[PDB]
Structures are given as C-alpha cells and as structure tokens.
Paper text:
Filamentous bacteriophages package their circular, single stranded DNA genome with the major coat protein pVIII and the minor coat proteins pIII, pVII, pVI, and pIX. Here, we report the cryo-EM structure of a ~500 Å long bacteriophage M13 mini variant. The distal ends of the mini phage are sealed by two cap-like complexes composed of the minor coat proteins. We further performed local refinements of the mini phage by dividing the particle into the top, middle and bottom three segments.
The top spheric cap is a complex of pIX, pVII, and pVIII. The five pVII molecules form a symmetric plug-like pentamer that are located at the top middle of the cap. The five pVIIs mainly interact with each other through hydrophobic residues, including F7, I10, A13, M14, L21, A24, L25, and A29. The 5 pIX molecules of the protein layer 2 assemble around the pVII pentamer. Interactions between pIX and pVII mainly involve hydrophobic interactions, hydrogen bonds, and salt bridges. The molecules from the first layer of pVIII (layer 3) are inserted in between the pIX molecules and have a completely different contact environment compared to the pVIII molecules from other layers. The bent angle (~34° from the main axis of the virion) of the pVIII in layer 3 is significantly larger than those (~21°) of the pVIIIs in layers 4–5 and the middle part of the particle, due to the specific environment of pVIII molecules in the layer for establishing interactions with pIX and pVII. The cap constituted by pVII, pIX, and pVIII has a unique lumen that is decorated with four positively charged residues, including R33 of pVII, K40, K43, K48 of pVIII and one negatively charged residue, E29 of pIX. Among these, residues R33 of pVII and E29 of pIX are in proximity to the encapsidated DNA genome, indicating that these residues could be involved in direct interactions and specific recognition of the genome packaging signal, which was supposed to have a hairpin structure. Further mutagenesis studies of residues E29 of pIX and R33 of pVII showed that these residues are essential for the assembly of living viruses.
Residue numbers in the entry:
A (entry chain F), B (entry chain IA), C (entry chain BA), D (entry chain L), E (entry chain S): 5 to 33
F (entry chain Z), G (entry chain C), H (entry chain E), I (entry chain A), J (entry chain HA), K (entry chain G), ...: 5 to 50
AE (entry chain D), AF (entry chain GA), AG (entry chain J), AH (entry chain Y), AI (entry chain Q): 1 to 32
Amino acid sequence: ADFDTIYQAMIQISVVLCFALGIIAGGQR
Amino acid sequence: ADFDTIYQAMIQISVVLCFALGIIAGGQR
Amino acid sequence: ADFDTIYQAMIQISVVLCFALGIIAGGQR
Amino acid sequence: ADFDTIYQAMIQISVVLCFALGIIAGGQR
Amino acid sequence: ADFDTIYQAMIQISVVLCFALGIIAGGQR
Amino acid sequence: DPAKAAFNSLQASATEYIGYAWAMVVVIVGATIGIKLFKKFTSKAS
Amino acid sequence: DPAKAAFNSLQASATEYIGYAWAMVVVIVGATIGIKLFKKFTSKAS
Amino acid sequence: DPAKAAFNSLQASATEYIGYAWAMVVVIVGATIGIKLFKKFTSKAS
Amino acid sequence: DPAKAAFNSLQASATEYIGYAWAMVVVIVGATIGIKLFKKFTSKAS
Amino acid sequence: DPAKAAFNSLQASATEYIGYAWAMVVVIVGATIGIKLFKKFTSKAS
Amino acid sequence: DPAKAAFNSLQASATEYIGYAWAMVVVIVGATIGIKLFKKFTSKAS
Amino acid sequence: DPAKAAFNSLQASATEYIGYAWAMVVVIVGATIGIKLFKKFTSKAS
Amino acid sequence: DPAKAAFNSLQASATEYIGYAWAMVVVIVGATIGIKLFKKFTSKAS
Amino acid sequence: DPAKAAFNSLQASATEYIGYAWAMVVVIVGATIGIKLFKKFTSKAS
Amino acid sequence: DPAKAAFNSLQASATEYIGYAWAMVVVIVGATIGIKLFKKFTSKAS
Amino acid sequence: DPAKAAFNSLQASATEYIGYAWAMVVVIVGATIGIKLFKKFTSKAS
Amino acid sequence: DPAKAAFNSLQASATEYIGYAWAMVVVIVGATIGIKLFKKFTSKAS
Amino acid sequence: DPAKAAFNSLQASATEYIGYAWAMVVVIVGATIGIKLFKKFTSKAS
Amino acid sequence: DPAKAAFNSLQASATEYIGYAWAMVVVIVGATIGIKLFKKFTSKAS
Amino acid sequence: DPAKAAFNSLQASATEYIGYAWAMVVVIVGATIGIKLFKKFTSKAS
Amino acid sequence: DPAKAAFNSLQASATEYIGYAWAMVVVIVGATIGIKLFKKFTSKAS
Amino acid sequence: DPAKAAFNSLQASATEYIGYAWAMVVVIVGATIGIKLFKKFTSKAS
Amino acid sequence: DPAKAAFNSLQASATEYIGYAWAMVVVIVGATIGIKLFKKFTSKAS
Amino acid sequence: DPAKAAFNSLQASATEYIGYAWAMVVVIVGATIGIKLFKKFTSKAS
Amino acid sequence: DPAKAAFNSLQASATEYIGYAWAMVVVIVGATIGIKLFKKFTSKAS
Amino acid sequence: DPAKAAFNSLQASATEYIGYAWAMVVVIVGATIGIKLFKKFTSKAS
Amino acid sequence: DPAKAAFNSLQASATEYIGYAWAMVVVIVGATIGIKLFKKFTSKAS
Amino acid sequence: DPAKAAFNSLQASATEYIGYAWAMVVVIVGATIGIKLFKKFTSKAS
Amino acid sequence: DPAKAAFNSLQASATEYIGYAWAMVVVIVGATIGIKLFKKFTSKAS
Amino acid sequence: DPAKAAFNSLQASATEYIGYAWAMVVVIVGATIGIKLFKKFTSKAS
Amino acid sequence: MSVLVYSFASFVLGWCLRSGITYFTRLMETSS
Amino acid sequence: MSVLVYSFASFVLGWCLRSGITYFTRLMETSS
Amino acid sequence: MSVLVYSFASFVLGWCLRSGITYFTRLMETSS
Amino acid sequence: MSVLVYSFASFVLGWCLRSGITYFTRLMETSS
Amino acid sequence: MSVLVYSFASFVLGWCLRSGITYFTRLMETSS
C-alpha cells in the first residue's frame, strides 16, 4: 500500500526470522 | 505490479519461510 | 527497474530459498 | 518511507541474517 | 535510492544467502 | 487481514505435508526397529 | 492414527522375535548342558 | 494464540506416545532378563 | 522506533513459545530417562 | 498438490529400500551367528 | 507405574527360576555324592 | 519452575529403581552363593 | 543490550542445572558401584 | 511359560543320565571288588 | 516375512552344529574313558 | 502464473542436483560400509 | 543399609551349612574308622 | 558504504554474543566433563 | 565439591564391605581346614 | 537406478568378506583345538 | 581467556579424581589379594 | 578480506586448544593404563 | 546479467572461505584422530 | 550448469579420499589383529 | 557349507590323535606291568 | 581390491603365528612329559 | 592439496603408534608368559 | 608413586602370611611325624 | 611430540611394575616349594 | 617382523627354564631314590 | 503487529507438527 | 495464495528428494 | 543501526531461551 | 529465470565445497 | 558487489566465532 506499510511489515518479518534462526542455532547440541 | 501486490506476496512468502524454519527447529533431536 | 521486475525476481528467489530449506529439513536424520 | 530508507534497512537485515546462518553453519560438528 | 539499486542489491543478497544455506545443507553428516 | 488469510492457507497445506511425513515415518521406523530387534534377539539367543 | 499403527506393528514384531528366540535358547542350552552332564557322569561312573 | 490448538494436540499426542514406549520397554526388558537368568541358573545348577 | 515495538511484541510471543516447549520437554525427558534408568538398573540387578 | 508426484515417487522408492535392508541384514546376521556358534560348539565338544 | 509392575514381575520370575535350579542341584549332587560314597564304602567294607 | 519439577520426578524415579534393584540383587546373589556353598561342603563332608 | 536480561536469566538457570546434575550423578554412581562391589566381595568371600 | 518347560526337560535329561551312570558304576565296582575278593580268598585258602 | 525365514534358518544351522558336536564328544570321551579303564583294569587283574 | 513458471524451472534444476547427490552418495556409502564390514568380519574371524 | 542385611543373611546361611557338614562328616568318619579298628582288632586277637 | 557501517556495527554486536556464549560454554563443559571423568574413574577404581 | 564427598563415601562403603567379606572368609576357611585336619588326624592316630 | 547399484556393490562386498572370514576362522580354530587335544591326549597316554 | 580457565578447571578436576581413584584401587586390591593369599597358605600349612 | 582478522584469531586459538587436548589426554591415559597394569600384575604375581 | 556478476563475485569469495576451512579442518582432524589412535593403541598394548 | 565444474571437482576429490581411507584401514586393522593373535597364540602355546 | 567341512576335518584330526595316544599308552602300560610282574615272579620263585 | 589383499595378508600372518606356536608347544610338552615319565619310571624300576 | 597433507600426517602418526605399541606388547607379554612358565616348571621339578 | 607403595605393602603382607604358614606347618608336620615314629619304635621294641 | 613422551613413560611404568611383580612371585613361590619339599623330605627320611 | 623376534625370544626363555627344571628334578629324584635304596638294602642285609 | 503475530504462529505450528514425529521416533527407538 | 502454494510445493519437493537419500543411507547403515 | 540492533537482540534472545532447554536435557542425560 | 538459475547454482556450489570437507572427515574418522 | 562482499564477510565472521567454541568443546570431550 504505502512505503511506510512495506517498511513496518519488513521489520516485523525480520525480527521473527532472526528469532527462528536463534532457536535453530541454540538447539545445536 | 502494485504496492499492494508486493505487500500481499511478501506476507505469503514470510509465513511459508517461518513454517520451513519451524520444521528445521522441530526436527533437532 | 519496474515493479513487475522486482515482483518476478522476488518470487524466483522465494522458491529457491524454500527448496534449500527443504533440503536442510530433509537431511535431518 | 523513502527508497533510501528501505535500502539501508534491507542491508542491515541482510548482514544480521548472514551472521545467524554463519553461527548455525559453524555449530555443525 | 533507485529501483535498479534495490534490484541489484536484492540479487547480491539472494546469492550470498543461497551459498550460506548450501554450506549448512552440505555440513549435515 | 492478509496475514490471517496466508496463515489459514498454510494450515491446510501443513496438514497435507504432516500427513505425507507420517505415512513415510511409520513404514521407515517399522523397518529400522525390526532389523534392530532382529539383530538383538538373535544375538541374545546366542 | 498412523502412530497407533506403527506401535501395533512393532509390538507384533517384538512378540514374534521373543517366541523364536526362546525356542533357539532352549535347543542351544540343552546341547551345552547335555554335553557337560554327559562328560561329568561318564567320568564318575568309569 | 492461533497455534494454541497445535500445542494442545501435541500435548494429547505426547502422553499417548509415553504409554506406548513404557509398554514396549517392559516386554523387551522382560524377555532379555528372562533369557539371561535362565542361562545363568542352568549353568550354576550344573 | 518501529523495530523496538516489533522486538517488544516478539518478547511476549517468545515467553508463550518457551512455556509450551518447557511443558513438553519436562514430560518427554521424564519418560526417556526413566526407561533408560529402568533398563540400566534391571541389567545391574542382573 | 504440485509435489504429490514427488511424494508418490518417495513412497515407491522407500518400499524398495526396506527390501534391500532386510536382505543384507539376513546375510550379515547369518554369517555372524554361524561363526560364533561354530567356535562355541567346537570348544564345548573338546 | 509400569516400572513397579515390571520390577515385581522380574523378581517373581527370578524366584521361580531359583526354585527350578535348586531342584536340579539336589538331583545332580545326590547322584554325585551317592556314587562316590558307594565306591568308597564298598572298598572299605569288602 | 518446570525444571525443578523435572529434576524432582527423575530423582523419585531413580530412588524407586535403586530400592527394587537392591532387593533383586540380594535374592539372586543368595541363590548363587547358596548353591556354591552347598556343593562345596557336601563334597568335604562326604 | 536489549537481550542482556535473557543472558542473565540463562546464567542463573545454568548454575541451578549443574547442581541438579551432580546430585543425580552421585546417587546413580553410588548404587551402581555398591551393587558391583557387593557381588565381587561375596564371590571372593566364597 | 517357555522357561518352565525347558527347566523340566533339562531335569528329565539329567535324571536319564544318572540312571545310566548308576548302571555303569555298579558293573565297574562289581568287577574290581570281585577280582580283589577272589585274589584275597585264594591266598588265604592256600 | 524375511525375519521368520532367517530365524528358522539360524535354528536349523544350530541343530546341525549340535549333531556334529555330539559326534566329536563321543569320539573324545570314548578314547578318554577307554584309556583310563585300560590302565586301571590291567593293574587290577595283573 | 509467475510462481508456476518459477516452480517448473526449479523442478528441472532439482533433478540435476538430486542426480549429482545420488552419484556421490552411492560411491561414499559403498566405501564407508565396506570399511565397516571389513573391520567387523576381520575381528569376527578373530 | 541393604548390603549390611544381605551380608549378615549370607553369613548366617553359611554357618547353617557348616553345622550340617560337621554332623555328616562325624557320621562318615565314625563309620570308616569303626570298620578299620574292627578289622585290625579281630586280626590281632586271632 | 552503508554495508560497511552495518558490518562494523555487527562486529561490535558479535563480540558481545561470543562473550556471552564463552561464559556459558566454559561452566557447562566444566560440569559435563567432570561428571564424565567422575563416572569413568570411579568405575576404573572398580 | 560433590565429587570429593561422593568419592569418600564410595571408599568408606568399600571398607565396610571388606570387613563383612573377611568375617565370612574366616568362617568358611575355619570349617574347611577343621574338617580336613579332623579326618587326617583321626586316621593318623587311630 | 543409482540405489540398486549401491545395494548390489555392498551385497557383493559382504559376500566376499563372509567367504574370506570363514576360511580364516577354520584355520585359527583348527590350531586352537589341535593344541588343546594334543596336550590332553599326551598326558593321558604318558 | 575463558578457554584457559576451562582447561585449568578440568585439569584440576582430573588430578583430584586420579588421586582419589588410586587410593580406592589400593584398598580394594589389597583385600582381594589378602583373601586369595590367606586361603592359599592356610591350605598348604594345614 | 574484512573477516581475515577473525580467521587469523581462530588459527592462533586452534593451535592453543590442540596443546590443551594433548596435555589432558596424556594424564588421563597414563592413570587409566597404570591402574589396569597394577591390577593385572598383582593377580599374575599371586 | 546482474545475477551472473553476483555469482562470479561469489565464486571468488567462496574459494577464500573454503581455503580457510581446509587449513583449519586439516590441523583439527590431525589432532582428534591422533588422540583417538593414541588411546586405542595404548589400550591394545594393554 | 554454472556449478557443474564444482561437482566434477568433488567427484575427482571423492575417489582420492576413498583410496586414502582404504590405505589407513588396512594398516590399523593389520596391527590390531596381529597384536590380538600374538597374545592369543602365546597363551595357548603355554 | 564351510562349517560342515571344518567340523569333519576337526573330527578327522581328533581320530588321528587318539590313534597315536592308544599306541603310546600300550607301550607305557606294557613297560610298567612288565617290571611289576618280573619283580613279583622272581620274588615268589626265590 | 585393497580388502582382498589385506584379508590374504591377515590369513598368512595367522598361519606363520600357528607355526611359531606349535614349535613352543612341542618344547614345553616334551619337557613336561619327559620329567613326569623320568620320575615315574625311576621309581618303578628302582 | 591440504587433503594429502592431512592423510600423510595421520599415516605417519599411525606408523609411530604401531611401532611403540608392538614394543610394549612384547615386554608385557614376556613378563606374563615368564611368570606362568616359571611357576609351572618349579612345581614339576620340585 | 602410589603404585610403588601399594606393591611394597602387598609384598610385606605376603611375607607376614608366609611367617604364619611356616609356624603352622612345623606344628602339623611335627605332630604327624611324632605319631608315626612312636608307633614304629614301639612295634620294633615289642 | 607429546605422544612419543607419553608412550615412553607408559613403557617405563610397565617395566618397573614387572620388577615389583617378579619380586612378589619369588617370595610366594619360594615359600610354596619350601613347604612342599619340607613335608615331602621329612616323610621320606623319617 | 616384530612378532617373529618376540616368539623366538619367548621360546629361547622357555628352553632356559627347561634347562633349570631338569637340573633341579635330577637332584630331587636322586635324593629320594637314594634314601629308598639305602633303607631297602640295609633292611635286606640285616 | 499483525504480520509478526501470524508469522510467529506459523513458526510454532511448524515446530508442533514436526516435534510429534521427533518425540515418537526417539521414544520408540530408546524403548527397544 | 498462488505464491504460497508454489513456495510450499517447492519446500515439499526439496524434503521428498533429500529424504530418499537420508532413508537409503540410514537403512543400509543399520542393516550392516 | 536501529533495525540491526533489534534484529540482533532477537537472535540472542532466541539462542538464550532454547539454550536453557539444550543444557538441561544434556546435563540430565549424561547425569544418568 | 536468470536469478533462479544463478541462485540455484550458488546453492549447488556451496553444497559441493562443504561436502568435500564432510566426506574427508567422515571417511578418515571411520577409517581409524 | 559491496553488499555481497560485506554480507559474505558477515557469514565468515559468524563461522569463525562459533567454530572456536565447536573445536574447543570437541577436542576437550574426546581428550577425556
């Protein structure tokens, strides 16, 4: 819709991907 | 094509990536 | 270049990432 | 907001994803 | 800055992510 | 919500994938544990 | 439920192996004990 | 939570799997110890 | 900061996920180590 | 499902692999138990 | 608790094996001592 | 704390197993020692 | 650091887990060595 | 109970061996005692 | 079932080994008892 | 559909990658299991 | 202390066996010595 | 370069993360190897 | 240190077992030597 | 099919190893049994 | 350097365990050898 | 290379870790072989 | 092609990374397998 | 295929690694079996 | 059947050893009996 | 095939060990039988 | 090639270990055999 | 050197046992020889 | 090389153990042969 | 060939022990036979 | 926050579905 | 939903292709 | 730098939460 | 299709480079 | 090429930092 809309959505997607990668990295024994 | 087009496509790509990362995280014994 | 250009490129990047995540998930014994 | 805003944010997201993938790759014994 | 700028940057980010996922997939014994 | 619609579509797709995985997992584990139990009990009979 | 099917198949496999194993144990044990007792008594009697 | 239903399903599935495991452990351990004790006692009993 | 708001929302979501994982981890490890301790101590009694 | 063909191929491939495994298990276990029993009986037979 | 039930069963199975073993010991020992005393006392008397 | 609950449950499981194991050790050891001492003294006295 | 609190929580949790581990190790090793020594000494003591 | 049948068959075979050992020991003891008595009586007579 | 066929083959292989073993035992025991009785009876008679 | 075209291109690329992986997997597993079977059977010959 | 009770019970059983062995050895020794003395005295008298 | 600035900021953040990981790794490995060395040396004393 | 405390306890547990073992040895050896000397000296004197 | 080629190569490798192993078992077993029988008979005859 | 601290702590742990283990080895070995030598000489002297 | 410094640090860190490993291996292996040889020689030395 | 240029730049960067990994892999595996071979051969000398 | 060159390099590298593995396996297995057979034969040879 | 040939060869070697043992025992028994009879007859004659 | 060459070498190494072992057996057995017959025949003749 | 360097270093390490191991085997085996032969002959001669 | 002290203590205990064995053997031998000489001398005198 | 130094130390530690062992063997064997010859020669002379 | 040298040294040591055993057995046999002949001749003369 | 909530829900759904396989396989394996 | 369906199909295709290798390797390994 | 700092904080948070499970499971497993 | 072809080539290149390390390490480990 | 070079440098930095932990843990584990 608007540039701000894309910006805010992209930021929220980034933090949730970084958390998932964090879980995968932490679960490596 | 349109900003809305990019926005909707990006959201659908995000959920399918998060599911794949979820499978990888869950398959860590 | 054009919105359509970005849209098509993003879709092709998405499928090739999902395949790579699929290989990583499938290779978990 | 602005194209430059999206560009700078995307670059910062990229380096932090590459570092996380680096940790996952390095933690594979 | 420009659409071409975003396009070129996105492509370079994609190949470097695919290489990192390739290392993670190849390091699975 | 566009995200809600995407998640609902993913839920339906997920049930297909987990149904596929389950049908393979069952047969594979039925074979590996059976060859493990076989080798173990033969050696126990000794 | 695919999980129940997997458990039932493995439970049946285990039961079969236990039965076959016990049969072979009896035959092999009988031979070993029989040889030992034979050698012991034949020397006592002689 | 949109995925609370998935967690609830996993919780009800896990308690079922634990019951399956304990059942199979008891039968395998029972046969293993039984065969081992049988061989030990018959040798001690000459 | 938009990133600050996203991180704060993630913190709340994370506590739900780690609460779910903990409730499953406890029960699963209570079962696996108990069947491991069971098999070990039975064989030690011998 | 665009990837249903891939699952169908994996299913037909898995049943073939299980047959391969059982064939190799039988030959390896057969030789192992045979050699072990041969040594045991020859020593008992003096 | 499946553990308690299994442990009690393994103890009862051991107890019954001990009963069978002692019966066999008495039979073997009785013949052994009997033959030895027979040969000894016959020589001593005659 | 879910971690404390997990530790407490496993500590209780271990304590139960140790008690049951020690009981079975005493019975099995008693039988083995009893058979050996019986065979030794019966030959010395005879 | 926005996640310094998470590290501090993990640090206080880790020292608790290490205490749990050492407690369970001592009890399991104690019973294992005790049973093994009991069997060894009773056999040596005839 | 496979173990019960196996123990009974082993004890039945053991009883069979004793029956044969006692028959042979009677023959051997009779022969040696006969020679001893014959030589002793003839020497005393002459 | 490949398992059943293999288990039956391993039991038949054990049975034939027991037959060969018993033949060897008879030959060795026969010579042992024969030599012992030969030396004993020769001394007793002459 | 742009996504359809991308997926169809990926299908062709995937067959190349899985063909490469298969040609390496076969040779590598032929070597590792052969050195595993070698070490096992040499030690069994003993 | 389960071990202390077990050791005490084993020593009590051992003392029981000695009591029986000494009773039997007195009877056997008395019988053989009696026959020897009887034959010796009668020969000296005549 | 915007990428240069992002990488330089990441370098500073990385040193914090690797400092956290190191402080946890040291304590955890000090505990696991100590319980491994403990169990090993107790069993070696035997 | 939990390690030191456990090691001292395992050493004290071994020490008490050695005490129990030596008591049993004296009882068994005393009866064995006593019976042997009894039969020997009785024959030598009478 | 690369999978069939892998299975066939491993099946051939296993067959070769079994043949070579059985040959070495016969030679080593023959020497051990030969030495034992030689020492046994040479003492009986002497 | 956190790595040096980890190595130093583990080196100290190993040194303590080796010392405690050697002490227990001496006590347990002394008892086993003492019992064996006692039983050997008491039979030679008697 | 912006991360060449990180590789250089890892290289200087790795050679230090290898030295740490060899030092700990020598002390653990030394104690293990020493205790094992001590028990072996004392038993052979009677 | 912009993608072609990116891939060509990645190829050059990849050779640097795989050169770094190889230089570390060689030294690390030279150390781990050497401490594995060391522990194995010392215990084989026994 | 832009990465066909990489696959071709891996293929030529893999066949070299397999040769390296077989060479090291033969030398390690040779020494292991040799030492084991030497100890076995010297004990059998008295 | 490699085992059948091996068992037959072992029994053939066993029969060979008996042939030699019987030859030697005849010589040894003949010599000792001859000396005994010679001394006895000469003493009776004179 | 490196496997075939290694297997043939291990068989030849076993064959040469058997040759050395038999030489040692003859020397030891010769002295043992010689000393025994020497003491026996000397007593019989003188 | 870093791979060749790694293989060469490990091949050299293995060769050194085999040489050192064989030397220690000879010394330890010599002592064990020497003690056994000494105790055997000293009893035969005495 | 913990081993040196342990070996010295074991040898000191061994020397203690010999001191006691020699004392007892003198008493037993003196008693039996005394009875033999007494009976012999009295018979010759009368 | 830490390996070489450790291997030389383990060989020297074995050598010193062999020295201690031989000293103990001489003491035990000397008493054993001495007691046996004492009882034998006393009976032969008186 | 390290094994060849080791076997030769063991056989050389064995031959040494025989040389010493034969020397001692000549002395012991000479002494006992001398006492027997002396007593026999003196009794016949008187 | 909508895309964060639904993307996180997707991650938790994926973990829950696969974890059911992992637990079943692990329990049955150590059971035998 | 088109990009979601095709992206998910790509993930399932990748799992299916690699899982064939994993199962073959695991079965053959435990078979010996 | 804001999105980098908060995205990195998210990664560290995820590692910290899961590492607590990994350490607990590993310690208890090797403890028995 | 250009970005798909080159991105896929990057993935295959990464697998090939790392797989060489994995195979070498695994073979040498089981070799000893 | 700037974003590729710096993104790749980030990946190598991450591998180097974590690999130091992996090697230390593995060496010490097999050392005991």
